[PDB]
Amino acid sequence: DKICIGYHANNSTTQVDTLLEKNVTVTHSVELLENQKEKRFCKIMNKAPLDLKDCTIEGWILGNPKCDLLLGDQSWSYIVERPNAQNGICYPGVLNELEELKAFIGSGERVERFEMFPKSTWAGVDTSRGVTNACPSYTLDSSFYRNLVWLVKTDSATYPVIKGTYNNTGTQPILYFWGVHHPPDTTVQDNLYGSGDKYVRMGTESMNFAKSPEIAARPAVNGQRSRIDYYWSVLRPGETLNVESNGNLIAPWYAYKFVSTNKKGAVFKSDLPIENCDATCQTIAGVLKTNKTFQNVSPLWIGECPKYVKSESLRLATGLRNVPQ
Amino acid sequence: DKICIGYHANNSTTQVDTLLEKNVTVTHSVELLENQKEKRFCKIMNKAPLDLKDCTIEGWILGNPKCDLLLGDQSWSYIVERPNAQNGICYPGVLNELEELKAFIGSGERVERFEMFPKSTWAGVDTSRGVTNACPSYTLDSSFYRNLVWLVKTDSATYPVIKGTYNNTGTQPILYFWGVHHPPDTTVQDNLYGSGDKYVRMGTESMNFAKSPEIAARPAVNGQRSRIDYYWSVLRPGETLNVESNGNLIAPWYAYKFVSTNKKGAVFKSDLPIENCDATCQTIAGVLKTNKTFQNVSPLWIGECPKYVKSESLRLATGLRNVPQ
Amino acid sequence: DKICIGYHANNSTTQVDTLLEKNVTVTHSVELLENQKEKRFCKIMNKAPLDLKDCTIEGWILGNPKCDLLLGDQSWSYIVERPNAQNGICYPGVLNELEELKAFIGSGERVERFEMFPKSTWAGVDTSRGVTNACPSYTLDSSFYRNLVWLVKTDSATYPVIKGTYNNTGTQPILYFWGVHHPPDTTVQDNLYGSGDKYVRMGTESMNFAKSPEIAARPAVNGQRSRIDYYWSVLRPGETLNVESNGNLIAPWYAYKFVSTNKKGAVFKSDLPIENCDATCQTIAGVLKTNKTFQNVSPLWIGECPKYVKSESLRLATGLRNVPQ
Amino acid sequence: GIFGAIAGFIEGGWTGMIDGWYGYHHENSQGSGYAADRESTQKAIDGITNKVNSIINKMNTQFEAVDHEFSNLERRIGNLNKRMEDGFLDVWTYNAELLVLLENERTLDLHDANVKNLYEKVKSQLRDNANDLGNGCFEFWHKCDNECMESVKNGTYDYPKYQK
Amino acid sequence: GIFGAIAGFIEGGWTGMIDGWYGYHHENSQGSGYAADRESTQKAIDGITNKVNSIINKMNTQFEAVDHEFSNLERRIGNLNKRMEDGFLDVWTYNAELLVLLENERTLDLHDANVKNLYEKVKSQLRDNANDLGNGCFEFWHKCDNECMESVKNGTYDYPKYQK
Amino acid sequence: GIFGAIAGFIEGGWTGMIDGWYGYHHENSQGSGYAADRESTQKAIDGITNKVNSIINKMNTQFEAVDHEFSNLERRIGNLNKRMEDGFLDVWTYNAELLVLLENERTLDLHDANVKNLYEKVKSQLRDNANDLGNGCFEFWHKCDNECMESVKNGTYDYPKYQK
Ligand SMILES: CC(=O)N[C@H]1[C@H]([C@H](O)[C@H](O)CO)O[C@@](OC[C@H]2O[C@@H](O)[C@H](O)[C@@H](O)[C@H]2O)(C(=O)O)C[C@@H]1O
Ligand SMILES: CC(=O)N[C@H]1[C@H]([C@H](O)[C@H](O)CO)O[C@@](OC[C@H]2O[C@@H](O)[C@H](O)[C@@H](O)[C@H]2O)(C(=O)O)C[C@@H]1O
Ligand SMILES: CC(=O)N[C@H]1[C@H]([C@H](O)[C@H](O)CO)O[C@@](OC[C@H]2O[C@@H](O)[C@H](O)[C@@H](O)[C@H]2O)(C(=O)O)C[C@@H]1O
Ligand SMILES: *[C@@H]1O[C@H](CO)[C@@H](O[C@@H]2O[C@H](CO)[C@@H](O)[C@H](O)[C@H]2NC(C)=O)[C@H](O)[C@H]1NC(C)=O
Ligand SMILES: *[C@@H]1O[C@H](CO)[C@@H](O[C@@H]2O[C@H](CO)[C@@H](O)[C@H](O)[C@H]2NC(C)=O)[C@H](O)[C@H]1NC(C)=O
Ligand SMILES: *[C@@H]1O[C@H](CO)[C@@H](O[C@@H]2O[C@H](CO)[C@@H](O)[C@H](O)[C@H]2NC(C)=O)[C@H](O)[C@H]1NC(C)=O
Ligand SMILES: *[C@@H]1O[C@H](CO)[C@@H](O)[C@H](O)[C@H]1NC(C)=O
Ligand SMILES: *[C@@H]1O[C@H](CO)[C@@H](O)[C@H](O)[C@H]1NC(C)=O
Ligand SMILES: *[C@@H]1O[C@H](CO)[C@@H](O)[C@H](O)[C@H]1NC(C)=O
Ligand SMILES: *[C@@H]1O[C@H](CO)[C@@H](O)[C@H](O)[C@H]1NC(C)=O
Ligand SMILES: *[C@@H]1O[C@H](CO)[C@@H](O)[C@H](O)[C@H]1NC(C)=O
C-alpha cells in the first residue's frame, strides 16, 4: 500500500513569459489584449455617424453647392471625413480659426439649418448677382455658398450702409458664418462696391468685429485673383447680433442651431465603409467587440474601449507549470 | 514538559486588501491616505490671502468704483475670487489677453498702486468729464475706473495730439492698463473727439501698439451701445513708455508696482470663508493638516500637500494575519 | 567522513538597497544609471553642428552684417546658440512669431541661400540708399541686413507702386523674410516715402498679408526712434509669391531653400566647446558614451540616449548576499 | 519552482487528474485512482481569480487621444500634444508588460508553494506509519482501505491507531 | 500563508503574547507563560519600517494642477491641459493602489516565512530530545526547567547533554 | 533570508568556492576541496540574466523634452509644457527606483530559496546513511570515496547499498 502527492497537467501548449523565464508552457492562461478589429464604422448608442462623402467640413458647413447632399439638419454619434474629399472652400480664401471650428463641431451632436438673414435684410443693394465660376453646383457653372450671400451695389448707384439684426431668443447656440471680400485691384473694387473707404462690422454682447478690405494682387487660385476671409462665431442664447456694412460684405444667410454634447465626440479622417451595424466601441481603425482589458488597434476612439497599448500579447498565467510525461 | 511556537493576535478588526484576497483582518496597519479637510481658507507662510469679495479680478485691477475696498496696496499668499462677484468690467468691452493676465497676477505676491500719469500729462483736453452711468460708485450714478481716465476734447475746440512718458527707473516691473473707446456712430465720435481720422499709439523698448477706433452699432449692454477695448502690459525695469494719441484714448492713470513670486501662486474661485488660522497646505476644498502621504480631497493647492489621488483608502499592512480563538 | 552545503562569497564591498533593507553588500551587482558626461559638443551621424558664435538665430537668419561668417549654405546635425551672443536684430523691431520660427529652424537640417528678388524687381525707387548706423558691418558704420533691402523713393519724385513675383518651381520649401518700417513722425515718413496713405501687401496660394505703417514716437533703441516689424514665411513647392507695395517696404532680397528633417532636431543654448569628435548621444550638458539604460545628466538631447531620470544610483543585485568570515 | 516541488522533487505532473490542480493518487487493495484536494485547490482558485479581477479592475481607465488639428504656426503645441500622448502611451505599455511578467512569476511560485504545503500537510500526519520515498510518495507499513485513505484526505488520520 | 505556518499547521494565534510578533509558550514545573522572540521580531520590525519608509519616500513628489483659464477660442489647449492632468492622476492612482495590494500580499508572506523559519530554527536544535506533534508544539522526553528553556531561547541548547 | 538558508542556519559563505554560486565542500580520505553545483547555478544565472534583460528591455523608451521657447503672452502653455515634462520625469524616476528596490529583495529571496532547495535535494537522498548536524553539514556513518561523492553530486546516490 502507498499514496502519492502531485499536480495537474494537460494537452495545452499555451506559453507565457516571466522575469526569470521566457516561453513557458502552462495549463490555464488568459489573454488580456485584443488585436482583432472589424474594419468598418458602426452605430454608437444606436445613433449613426455622419459621412461627409466628397465634402470636407469646410464645404459642408459653408454650404458648398456640391455638398447639397448634406444640406439641412444632421445628427451624428461621430463624423467621418473622407481622405480625398474634393468639395470644401471653392472660392479662394482662409477660414479664420479653422482648427478651433473643427474642435467645436467635433464637440457636437446635431445641427438645424435655418434662415438667419433673408436677402431683404440688406436694403438697396443687389442680393441676386452674387455668383462666381469658382463655386459651381452640379447643374450650373456659376453659383455660390448656400449659407452666405454676396452683396453687390445696385446696377448703377453706390453702396448704401446696410444693417441686419438677429435676437437669439431661443435656448440653443447659433453657429454662423460671414466673410470679407478682398478684390485684386481698385477698378474691380469700384465695379462691385463703388469708391470710398469700406468697412465690415459685427457686434454682439460678447463679441465685436471690424475689418476693411485688403486689396492686392494674389496668385490665381480657381481662376480667381481675389480672396475671401471667412469667419465663424457662436451666438449664445440671449445674445443678439448686429451686422453693419457699407461694402465688401459676404453676409450670413443661413446658420445652424447647434447642440453641444458635453461628451467626447470624434472626427475621423478615414476611408473605411459605414455599415448598418451596431457597436459599443469605435476606433478610427474599426470596431472592437471585446471583454478584454487592453487593445493594440488604435488610441483614437469614440465609445467605451479597452486601454490602448503597444504590446503584441499580454498573457496572464492562472494555472501552474505544465509537465506531462 | 513541552514548548510551543506561535504568533501574535489581538482585538483589532482593521482590514486590508491584497491581490489574492480582499477584506483581510490584520494586527497592525497604517492609513496612507487623508480624506479629512477643514472647509476654510487659512494663512500660508504666516501670510494671508486676498478676498476679492464682491469684485472680480477685472474689477479689482481696473479700479472699479465699487471695488474701492480693494484700492491701494495688497499682499497675498493666494487669491480668492467669489463665485458670484458682481463688480468687474462695468463699461462694456473686452480685456485683451485676460486669461494670461490672470495667470500673471496669479504668479504674484504684492502690488503697490501709484500715479503713473497725472491728468496734466494730457495737454489741452478735458480730463474731468470722463464719466458714465455704466460705472457708478456707491455714492453717485456716474463715475469711471480709478486707474483709467477718459479724455474728451475741450468744451469747443478739437482734439490736439497728446503725449505722455514714464521712465521706469525703479527695480520693479509695472503692470498698467489702457483702452480704446469704440463709439456707436459718427455723430457721437464727433461729439466726443471731433472729426478727422483718430489713432492711439504706445511704444516701449520691447513693445509697440497702434489702433484706430472701430465705430459701429452694438447691442445695448449696461445701457451703452459703445465698447472699450481694454489692454494691459508690463513695463520692465529700465523700459520707458511713450503714449501718443489724437483721440479715443482711455489713458492710464494709476498703475501697479508688481512683485513676482517665482513660486507657484494660486487663484481660487471659491465661496469658502477665510478665517484667522494658520496652515501648511491649502487646497481649493480646504485645509489639510496631515503627516500622511496621499490625499483624495483636491488636486488644486498652494503650499506643501500630499499627492492627490482618486482612492478611498490606501491601507498598508505592517502586522501579520489576525487569528484569535 | 562528511559533506557540507553552502554558498559563494568574495572581497566585494558593493552595496544595494531593498524595500526591507538598505546598505546591503552583495557578490555581483550592476549599475544601470550613467552619471558621467564629456562636457563637449560632438558630431552626430558623422555630421557636425552649427556654431552660431557671436550671432543669435535672428541675426544669423536675417543676415546681420556682423554674422557674415555664417552667410551662405549651412548643414547641421543640431544648432548651438551662444548664451551671450551679441549679434541679432540690429535695427529695433519685432520678429513676428519668433518662437515658431525657432521651432521650425530647429526641425531643419540644411539651408541654401539664394537671391529671390534682385533690386531691379523694384522699379523706379532707390534700392541703394537703404542703410543705417544701427546695423554696421565690421568695416563700416552704416549698412543693413544681407537678406533684406530698404526701399526709398527716388531722390525727388514720389513712391510708385512696386511689384515682385517668385514662382517656386522647385522641389524644396523657401524660408523668406520681409518687414514693415514704422517711422517716428510725419516728416520722416514724408522724407522717405512721400505723402499719401501707404500699404504693404503679399499674396501666395495659401497666405495673404496686408499692413500699413503705425507711425508714432518710440523710446530710443540703438539710436533709432523708429521700428521694424519683421515677418517670416515659407513658400511651398508650387506656391508663388506676389509682392506689392506703394511704400514702407523692407523687401525680401535673399531667401533660403530649406530642408525638413522629419526627425527631432535640437537647438541648444550653451557655452560648451565644439570639438572634432564623434558621438551617438548628445545632451545639452555633454556627450554620453554608455551601454547603460538610465542617465541623470540631462533631459534635453539629440541622438540615441538613455532614459533621463533623477536618481543618483540604480544598483541591481545579480549575486547573493555576501557573508565572508 | 522556488519551493522545489513542481518540476523539482516532484519531477512531473499527472494528466490523469482532471478534477483539480493539486491532489492524490492512492494505491491499495480495492484499486487505485486519481482525486483532487478540493480545499487547497479552491483556495488557489479564489485567490487567483481575485488577483486577475484586481488587475483588470486597476487597469480600468483610459488615456484618450484626440483628433485635434494644429496649424502651420501651431507647430509647438501640436508637438506638445503628440509628446504627451506618446508619453502616456509609453508608461501604460511599460506598466502592462512589467506587471504581467512579475505577476506570472509570482503566480507560479504560488502554485509551487501550495504543492509543497500539501506535501508537508501530509507528512505531518503520517510520521512512523509510512515510508517517505522522497518523491512525493509514501509507502505504508500497515494496511489502508477506503475509509482509511479518506480519513487522511479529510485531514482526520488517527496516528495512534496505526502506530502499532 | 505560502510557508504554511500562519493559519495553517499553526491554526491560530495567541492573544496572550503581547510583547512581540513571534514567540513562545513554554510549559514545565515552575509554571507556564508567554514570551516573544525579540530577535526575529526586531528583524521583521526594522525590515517593515524600512519598507514603509521607502514607499513613503518614493511617493514624495506631487503633480500639480493649475487654475489656468482658457478662452472660447482656446478649446484645444484647454482640453489638452485637462487630458494631461487627468492622465497623470490616473497613473498615480493606479501606482498607489497596485503597490498597496502587492506589498500587502508580500508582507503577509514575509510574516509567514518568519514563523516557519523560527519553527525550523527550533526543530534543528532539538532532534531526539523531544516529540514533534506537528502543530508547532514539542513534547520533551527529559526534564527542562528555566535555565533550560532559556538556553533554547538564546539559541544555546546543548543537545549531547540531554540526548541520554 | 525568508527560506532561512543564507545568513541563517548556514551562517556564512565560502570565499573558497570561486567556480559558482551554490556548491559543495566534501571531506574524506583522498582529501577535501570545493566544487560548485553547476546545474542549479546555471539555472539561477539564466533566470537572473533573463530578469535583467527583461527590465532593460521594458525600460527602452525615452520621454523627450524640447528646447521650445514661449513668449511673454505664452505663460500658460509654457507652464503646461514644463508641468508635463516634470510630471513624466517624476513617474519614470519613481518606476525606476521602486522596481530596483522590489526586484533586489526578490532576487535575494530567490538565491536563498535555491540554497534551501539544494539542501533539501541532498537531504532527500541521504536519510539514514548520514547525520544531519543542522548547519548544512552531513556526517556519514559509512565510508565515501570519490566515485561516491560524485554519485551524490550527479544526483545518483544508491541508498540501498549503503543502508546496511
Ligand atoms: C457678379 C460678380 O462680381 N461676379 C463675377 C466674379 C467677380 O466679379 C470676381 O470674381 C471678383 O473677384 O468674377 C467672375 O469671373 C472672373 C474671371 O476671373 C478671371 O481671372 C478668370 O480668368 C476668368 O475665367 C473669369 O471667370 C467669376 O465667375 O469668378 C465672373 C462673376 O460673374
Ligand atoms: C461725457 C461723456 O461722453 N459721457 C457720457 C456717456 C458717453 O457720451 C457715451 O456713453 C459714449 O458711448 O454717455 C452717457 O449716457 C449715454 C446714454 O446711453 C443710452 O443709450 C442710455 O439709454 C441712456 O441711459 C444714457 O445714459 C452715460 O452715462 O453712459 C452719459 C455720459 O455723460
Ligand atoms: C537713408 C535713410 O533713411 N537712412 C537714415 C536713417 C533713417 O532715415 C532713419 O533711421 C529712419 O528711422 O537714419 C540714420 O540716422 C538717424 C539718426 O537717429 C537719431 O535719433 C540718432 O540720434 C542719430 O545718431 C542718427 O543716426 C541712421 O543711421 O539710422 C541715418 C540713415 O542714413
Ligand atoms: C431680444 O428680445 C427680447 C424680447 O423678446 C428683449 O427682451 C426685453 O428686454 C427689455 C430691456 O431691453 C426688457 O425691459 C423687456 O422686459 C424684455 N422683453 C421681453 C418680451 O422679454 C431683448 O432686449 C432683446 N435683445 C436685444 C438687445 O435685441
Ligand atoms: C530713463 O532715465 C535715465 C536717467 O535717470 C536715462 O539714463 C541715461 O541714459 C543716457 C543715454 O540715453 C546716458 O548717457 C546717461 O548716462 C543716463 N543717465 C542717467 C542719470 O542714468 C535713460 O536714458 C532714460 N530712458 C529714456 C529713454 O527715457
Ligand atoms: C509657375 O510656373 C509654372 C510654369 O513653369 C506654371 O505652370 C503652368 O500653369 C498653367 C496654368 O496656370 C498650365 O496651363 C501650364 O501647363 C503650366 N506650365 C508649365 C510649363 O508647367 C504655374 O502656373 C506658375 N504659377 C504661377 C501662378 O505663377
Ligand atoms: C519563444 O518561442 C518561439 C516559438 O514558440 C520561438 O520562435 C522564440 O524564439 C522563443 N523566444 C525565446 C527568446 O525563447
Ligand atoms: C468587504 O467587507 C465589507 C464589510 O466590512 C463588505 O460590506 C464588503 O462586501 C466586503 N467586500 C468584499 C468584496 O469582500
Ligand atoms: C549607507 O552606507 C553609507 C556608507 O557606505 C552611510 O554613510 C549611510 O549612512 C548608510 N545609509 C543608511 C541609511 O544605512
Ligand atoms: C472523513 O471521511 C469519512 C467518510 O468515510 C467521514 O465519515 C468523516 O466524517 C470525514 N471526516 C471529516 C472530519 O471530514
Ligand atoms: C542564555 O541564558 C542564560 C541565562 O540563564 C545566560 O546565562 C546565557 O549567557 C545565555 N546564552 C546566550 C549565548 O545568550
Ligand SMILES: *[C@@H]1O[C@H](CO)[C@@H](O)[C@H](O)[C@H]1NC(C)=O
Ligand atoms: C556520476 O558520476 C560518475 C563519474 O564517476 C559517472 O560515471 C556517472 O555516469 C554519473 N552519473 C550521472 C547520471 O551523471
